[PDB]
Every structure is written in structure tokens, then in C-alpha cells.
Symmetry: D2
């Protein structure tokens, strides 16, 4: 036998950081969950019980906290690039570092219509994420994403004109509910190293804001022919608004809301134009994916 691929590290590392402005007295908090997996000349730890090549996962954890102490943790594209660069520079035998960051929401509270200097709310489980792959000799590859953005529109979605054969029972519709959990990922141009990532730092928060804004406005305003056609519109707009990204990927479930025929009970009309009460369906669900690139 032979090792064909190997990586190891620390997952589910919870990290909080606070920034304090003691001129203004305003505090700002950041919370994330970090994973770091390393690759390199490590196969003998698997084949020969040679632990000399292992940077212990506990030491990887220590390194996350130390790096967070010594650097800004935002934007996450930058923090992940600094962290991954550390590992491949510090350790001659480590040749790639793979950093995932899940960013959790702590939105400043407004109290009596003024922002509070040190109190925050989790306004939803939506996440902002990065995957930063630092590969020695080959730069830094970054994917950015938003996930867990759960939305619903009650009309201005349609689905008709689909293939119909002996497996088909679904009725065409010109007016349905559409609800989904948005997972949207933008893939950046390869960066040559940390310096280039630093040179683009303002584009990271700006591109996440553009992706979110395009998602929300397109979802709300598109009289949707299908999940596929709406998601494609979102992707092309994001590509047109940030030339340093190469592709945009969407993964959208179709979280179904079924009409309920009540006409068996006192003639009640609850279907079609009369549909008011629906049964949200936990499973199954459609799942629609696409990756959009430039022509």
C-alpha cells in the first residue's frame, strides 16, 4: 500500500476577539469557528509511526489563538491568508495549509434609537465563510461565501413548461411560493502570496456586500421562471460587479410549501387563487446548483 493523499489538523476551533476604542469607548466583537488542515512531507507519520513530522493539533490550536492576538481577524479572507502563510513558512516540510473560517453574526444593538457601544445580538444564523488554500510555490486560492440566508416570497414565482412524461404528476403553476436557504460562493483570482491578498483587502467586504445585495434584490424582484433562471441572474450580476472573481456558484434548495385541498370540508376553497393556508414540507426538497464563469 501507499499514501496517495493526507492532511491533518484542528477543526471546530471557536475564537472570539474584541476591539476596544478607548477614545470613543466603543467595543466591537468578532466570533468565528476555524479549521486548519496541513499537508506536506508527513506520510511517515502514517506508515512508520514517525511523529517527528507532526505539528500537534493542539499546537495548531495554539497558533490560531496567537495569530488572532497578533493580527486583525477581519476580513476573514485576510486572516485565513495570514494563518495559512504562517504554517507553510514556519515549517519547511509543510507545503500546504487549508483554512476554513465560519464567521458568526454579532450585530450591534440599537437601544432607544442609538447604537450601543458594547451590546450585540445574533440576528440570524446566516454565516459569512472563507476557504483559503495556501500552497507553497502556488499562491493563495480563496473562495468566499454567504450561507444560511433563509428567504421566502409568497408570489411572483412560477414553474411551468417543464418536461412531461409517464413519470410526471406535477401540475404546472403560474403563481407559487418560493423559499430557499441561499449558499453563494465567489472564487477569487489566484493571489501570488500574502502581499497581493493585502493589496485587495477592501474588495473582500465590498464583494460580500455586493453578493448579498444582488441576492436579496434579485430574489425579491425577479418574477421567477424557475430557481435555475433566478440564480443565474444573480451570478451574472456579481461577475459584472467584481472583476477579480472568476466564478460564482449557487446551491439553492427548493423548500416546498404545498397547497391543502379542504374542499372535502364544508366546501372550503383553499386552492389556486383561493390558497391561503399551506403545509410547509420539511423533506424532500429540490436542489438546484450552478457555477457561472465568464464567456
Amino acid at each position: 500500500s501507499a499514501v496517495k493523499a493526507a492532511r491533518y489538523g484542528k477543526d471546530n476551533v471557536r475564537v472570539y476577539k474584541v476591539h476596544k476604542d478607548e477614545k470613543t469607548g466603543v467595543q466591537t466583537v468578532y466570533e468565528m469557528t476555524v479549521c486548519v488542515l496541513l499537508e506536506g512531507e508527513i506520510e511517515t507519520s502514517y506508515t512508520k509511526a514517525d511523529n517527528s513530522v507532526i505539528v500537534a493539533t493542539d499546537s495548531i490550536k495554539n497558533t490560531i489563538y496567537i495569530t488572532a492576538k497578533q493580527n486583525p481577524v477581519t476580513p476573514p479572507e485576510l486572516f485565513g491568508s495570514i494563518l495559512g502563510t504562517h504554517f507553510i513558512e514556519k515549517y519547511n516540510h509543510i507545503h500546504a495549509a487549508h483554512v476554513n473560517i465560519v464567521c458568526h453574526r454579532w450585530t450591534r444593538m440599537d437601544i432607544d434609537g442609538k447604537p450601543h457601544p458594547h451590546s450585540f445580538i445574533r440576528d440570524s444564523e446566516e454565516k459569512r465563510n472563507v476557504q483559503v488554500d495556501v500552497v507553497e510555490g502556488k499562491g493563495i486560492d480563496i473562495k468566499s461565501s454567504l450561507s444560511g440566508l433563509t428567504v421566502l416570497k409568497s408570489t411572483n414565482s412560477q414553474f411551468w413548461g417543464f418536461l412531461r412524461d409517464e413519470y410526471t404528476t406535477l401540475k404546472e403553476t403560474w403563481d407559487r411560493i418560493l423559499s430557499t436557504d441561499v449558499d453563494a460562493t465567489w472564487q477569487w483570482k489566484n493571489f501570488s502570496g500574502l502581499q497581493e491578498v493585502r493589496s485587495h483587502v477592501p474588495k473582500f467586504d465590498a464583494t460580500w456586500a455586493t453578493a448579498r445585495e444582488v441576492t436579496l434584490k434579485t430574489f425579491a424582484e425577479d418574477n421567477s421562471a424557475s430557481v435555475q433562471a433566478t440564480m443565474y441572474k444573480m451570478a451574472e450580476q456579481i461577475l459584472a460587479r467584481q472583476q477579480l472573481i472568476e466564478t460564482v456558484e449557487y446551491s439553492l434548495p427548493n423548500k416546498h410549501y404545498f397547497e391543502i385541498d379542504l374542499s372535502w370540508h364544508k366546501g372550503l376553497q383553499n386552492t389556486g387563487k383561493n390558497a391561503e393556508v399551506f403545509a410547509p414540507q420539511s423533506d424532500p426538497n429540490g436542489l438546484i446548483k450552478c457555477t457561472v464563469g465568464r464567456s
Copy 2:
């Protein structure tokens, strides 16, 4: 043997309802999860295989949807009272109906600074709940609550002066992080029946807004001596602002954020006034409860 207590029904019934204003073109959505458990002269279904006394759970489900078609589903205190009243009136042998409602958030979207007529976002997993117990001969007992309201303050929490003995290792602190998931419940005066519940309908949304506002402002502004002392302040203020509630109950976890001593690494100072990076702890957690009534 003998049956001492028995109840049965349908749980986890997902319900959506839409309201359409075709003068303004504005749609409004509501989504909940309902459970209904019935009690009455039903013991023979357990002891003698007598199913004649059972209102099938599927029929209970049908009844939830029909009631939702025929009535407003808001406020949930009203909807639960209508639903529970139906069961004890319709069925001579059913003497109590226990209705739980979990209300899910679908907040209208703002697009380009205007509210959208039919697009919504799940802005957090915070719930609004009711437990409505309709008991024949004895009125309607309602508990209202908010749950899953997750908050954090980065300073202006303290914990010192606690008991110290041979089991104690915890250091006193005059400046700590406080984070919790708020579960707050207000218990209404018994209502004599549906008419009385209807007569108070505006107080339900108003009291939920008061509880939420008091929670948020007290959490943000109290320089907290302990979780106990802060939660008590919230409860007394809610009681002073709604005379039709009898008690306020809080259940608050203390979701710990631990300092990380890094001085073992290049002398790094990250404790006390220098604390910037912390380790959020998933478990264990303090859990602090109280029920506050009037003197």
C-alpha cells in the same frame, strides 16, 4: 393498574398562512408549528382497546388547518384559544385542550430602502410562543414567551462576592463578557373563555413588544452584578407595565467566554485588561432561573 393521567394529539404540525391585500397589493405571511394534546374521558382507549373515544390525530391535524383557514392566526394567544375552545365544545367527552404554538420569523424585506410587498427574510431563529390550556369549566390559561434571543455584551458585567470554600477555584471579576439565549415567559390572568380573550387582543402583541424591549434595554444598560440581578430587573419592569399578567419567568444560560493565557508564548499579554482573544465554551454552562410575581 389504573390510568392516572392521559393526553394525546398531534405534534409538529407546520402551518403557513398568507394574507393578501388586493387594494394595496401587499402580502403578509405567518408561519408556525402547532401541537394540540387533548384530555377527557378517554381512558378506555388505553385500558380496553376502545377507539370510539379517540378523535384521530389526523383529524386533529385537519382541524388545525381548517381553523387556520376560517380565522386569523395572529396573535397566537387568540388562535390557540379559538382552536382549543373548538375541541372542548365540539366533543362532549373532551374536557381539556392543550395548544402549543411556535411562531417563526418572516420579516418583510427592505429593498432599496422600501418595504417589499411579498418578500421576506428569516432574521434569526428567535421564536414567539404560546401555551394555551383550555379547560372545560375552568377558562383559558395562557403563557406567552420569547425564546432563542441570543445576545452578548463585551463588558459591563461583573461577578464577585460569591461564596468561597474548599470547592471554589473561580477568580472574582469586575469586567467579564456576558452572553445568553433569553427564554422569557409571562403568565396571564385566567380568562373565563374565548370572549374574554378576544376582549384583550391588542394586549398580546403589546406585551410581547414590552417584554422584548425591556429585555434588550436592561441587558445592554445594566452594569450587571450577576445574571440573577439583571434578570430580576427585567421581570419587575414587565410586571409594572402590564397588570393582566401575574408572573414573569426567566431561564438564562451563562454561555461562558474564557480568557486565554498566552504569556507562555513570547510573553504575550492576553488576560485581564489586556484580554482580547477568548475561547467561547460550548459546554458546560451556568443556568439561572427565577419566577417573579407581585408582592
Copy 3:
């Protein structure tokens, strides 16, 4: 305002203990999750910021580990009684201690048909639980339970003869699937204190084994008229086999498996006696409860 009820403590405390027999070389492991909530003369911590009455939750955590070091952790009825007794004896102002224990499964592995001396498997998420309430002046109240025992029978369940009215659509059946997650609780006679609990220690594991065996055999062998009638049989048998318990409580969901009519496709017959492929339903679910006592 006034405090009407208050309790505080530590939740979600994970605990492992190992026993090593260095005559036989056999090791045995135990893993649980513990919560302890205390009551007593503590209201001033809520109303007056008086932390002197608080046994810090961290010290409660320390106490769980110390008690686990100094005593057997099995059976959980005993461990919870020792722990709760400690708090009300150690602290004059603490008058009740409420201990919940969730016991996790670590079943010894068999390798090449022999039990392994120190390797274990989690053979399901079924739990064994206790709630032990130690109340000064009033003894020790113990509830024991098994939960998360998930079972299915593919036939020999029926449901017919139920009430039928204008809310009913469900078809009678003489042959259905029955699946549930069993939650079964037995409530012990009040114990006067720790000595009496100790005097009954072998009855705790024996009664849990009886409850489990009765559950499994009755579920498998009863040609069930309804969930209610089967669960009642289980409860009466457990009461007849342990005179020191006063009541048995069951809470059983009816996790539905729906037939799928495929006759629209090439005449396929998949209903009634021809039913082979079914759609398991995640929600909603029936929920059936009863508490059985002695006549």
C-alpha cells in the same frame, strides 16, 4: 415585585469515569451529562445583588467532578442522590438540590467473539436517565427513565373504530406500520434519605432492565389496537414487577409511514396488501401519553 421561585446551577456537565481491574486487566467506562440546580435562601442574589448566597456554578461543576472521583457513578440513581445530598448538607442555606443525569452508551466490544478489555462502541443514542430531587426535610424523590429507544414493526399494528365526523378523512386500517421513539419513566416511592436509597441499590439496574425488556417484548408481540392500548400494557406489567415504584409514564410519538399510490404509473399496485414502498414522514406526528398508577 417578589421572587416566587428561583433555582440556579450548572448544566451540560460532561463526565467520564473509568474503572480499572488490575487483577483482570479489564477496564470499564461510564459517560454522562449532569445538571445540578439548587434552591434555598437565595432570593437576595436576585433582588439585592447579594452574591454571598451564591455557590458559584463553577464550584458546582468542581463538586460534580470531585464527587465522581470519590464515589461510584453507577447506578445513576445512587450517584445523583449522593451529589444532591452533599449540597443540602454542606450549605445551611441550600434546601433543595435537583440533579439530572443523562447516561450515554459505551458497550464493550466483542472482537473475534471475545469481550475486549478496554474498547467500546456507542450502540445507539438510547439514554438511561435519572432526575433526583433532594429536598431538605422531605427525602429524595427519584424518577428513572429510558429514552431515545427507536423501534419499528412492519405489521401487527392496527387502527380502526376511531371517532368519525366532518373533520375525519383517515381510512381505517387492520394492518399498518408502527414506529416510535420510546420515552418511559418510572417514579420511585419517596426515600427518606441517602441510607434508604443505598439499601435499594440493586433494584435500580434491575428495574431499568425490566422496563426495557417489557417495552421491547410488548412492542414486538402485541397485535396492537392503538398506541394507547399497547403502552398501557407495558406500564401495568412494569408496576406488577417492582413494588417500590408508584407510577409508570410513557410518551410515544407515532412516526408515520405513508403508503404511496403508484397506480397512475403503468397500473402499479403498491397499496393495501400490495404495499411495499412507503414514504416515512418527518412531521407531523401523533403524540400519545399516559401515566399509570396502582388501583
Copy 4:
């Protein structure tokens, strides 16, 4: 813009099937969760609102149930190959079908030491899975796996000799607890189509049994130098026992159990050889991966 990749279909489709032997009266149940994603000449559904190319996801769901009615659902490698082959043969414009199957455990009950003909238990959340990729022109690619197999050994694990530098605080150990959730995947030789998959059908259950047996016995018997070294041993043994698989992949978390120093309390000794009570850690966790192929 241009579509670079696209796939769509139905996820989270719950399926039960029963087999009845009415000579022996024995029933056997199978339960799974299925996902099917299709690829092909479908980009115009995204770019031009052309739904003519879409096989509706509801029809994909119908097709899963129909295929389950008409064929055995075991072994899952076979069922997934039949299902995926259907889509690329039925639809000229569909060129790949990607089928995931999660198989749930329903183990026959033993009652009074005899197997019961129609009653079953969920003996753990361990799953058996397949990913079957049917690609027109290019055969069938199958990955098989076991996941959620949670194990613990209380001794006969070590971790010493790892790299030590200014980021290292971890103490070497010659006797630790090792616990993990096993995710193990074997990748089969490409099959030319359904006929070849059928020709190997007995090897699927046999190879899953070999992988499980090798995992369990190696975990229990290896005096482990590290997670890496133990997992590698498992992989090489599986490769030596099934020549039709090309690689074996393991992904193992190191679910940490920390010693608890209690010597601050009455001199209690609970570390090193005296370690009996431990704190299981929910997060973070080491994560160790490797893919093993043949030399």
C-alpha cells in the same frame, strides 16, 4: 457570463421498503434517504428560462419510488446504479446521474432469544452509504462508506515524539483515551455499466463487512502510536482483502478526553496513573485524514 457547471435534482427523499416471505412469515425492512442530481444539456433552463429541458424534481422523486417498487433496494451500490442508469437512458439530453444513498439501521429484534419476524430496532445512528455516479459514455463510478461509527478505547493509545517548538504546550503521553467517529470510504474500480455492477453484487455486502470488521478489530487491538498510524493499518488491510477497490479513505476526528487535576482539593490525585475522572471535550477536535492506494 456562461454556465460552467450545472446539476439539479431531488434531495432528502426518505424511502422505506418491506420484503415479506409468506412461506416463512418473516418480514425484512429497509430504510434510506436518497438524493439524485442530474447533469446534461440543461444550461438553457438557467440562461433562457427554457424549462423544456427540466425533468421536474417531483418527477425525479416519483422515479425513485417507482424504481424501488420494481427492483431490490439492496445492496445500495446496485440500487443506485439501476436508478442512475435509468435517467441517462431514459432522457437523451441527460448525460450524468449522481445518486447518493444513506442507509439507516433497522436490525431485527431478538425476543426471548429468538429473532422476531417483523420487529426491528435502530441500533445506532451508524450509516452505510453509497455515492454512485453514472456518466454516459464513461460507466459507473461507485464510492461506498460507513459513517457515524462511534468508538472509544480507554488505554492502549499513545502520542509522543511529535514536533516541539515555541507553539507547543502539549505534554507527551504513553497512555491516553482515544475516541472517534469513523468515516471510511472505499472507491471501486470503474464499472462499464449496469451489467458489470450486477456481476459483482455479492462483493458489495462482503466488502462493507470486511471494512467494518477491520476497523473494529484494528481500533481495539492496535497499541496506537497516533490516529494516523492506526488508520493507515486499517486501510492497507482492506486493500489487501478486496482487489476490486482502488483506494481506501479515512476521516477520523480525535474527540478529546482531558484529565482533570483535582490536587487543589484535599490533595486528590486524578492525573497520570491515577486518572479516573475526565472531561470529554465537545470542541475543538483533531481531524486526521488519508487516502491509501496500491503501490
